[PDB]
């Protein structure tokens, strides 16, 4: 049971590192969304301002 528990723990230990890294993967997609919509917002403010 000591070796079997070490294997059970070894799987749960590593799977949580992969799952936790996926939160950072969602954060990188969110960072890209913030920057891409900021570029579109900046383009929108640029074309809105020059019209005046």
């Amino acid at each position: 049971d000591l070796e079997l528990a070490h294997e059970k723990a070894g799987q749960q230990l590593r799977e949580a590192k992969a799952q936790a890294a996926e939160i950072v993967e969602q954060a990188k997609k969110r960072a890209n969304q913030i920057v891409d919509e900021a570029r579109d917002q900046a383009r929108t403010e640029g074309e809105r301002l020059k019209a005046q």
Binding site: D1, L2, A5, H6
Partner: protein
């Protein structure tokens, strides 16, 4: 009853026997019991190591 040197022969055999059994009868059995003690103790500690 009658008093004889019979006690000498039995006492001499006993002194030699007491010195012999301490080296060839007790050590093999006490070691075989200490091994099981150690195996039960470390076997129970193995479950505590797995639980930690």
């Amino acid at each position: 009853m009658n008093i004889n040197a019979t006690l000498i022969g039995q006492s001499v055999a006993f002194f030699i026997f007491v010195l012999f059994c301490m080296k060839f009868v007790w050590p093999p059995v006490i070691a075989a019991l200490q091994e099981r003690q150690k195996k039960i103790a470390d076997g129970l500690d193995a479950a505590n190591r797995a639980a930690r």
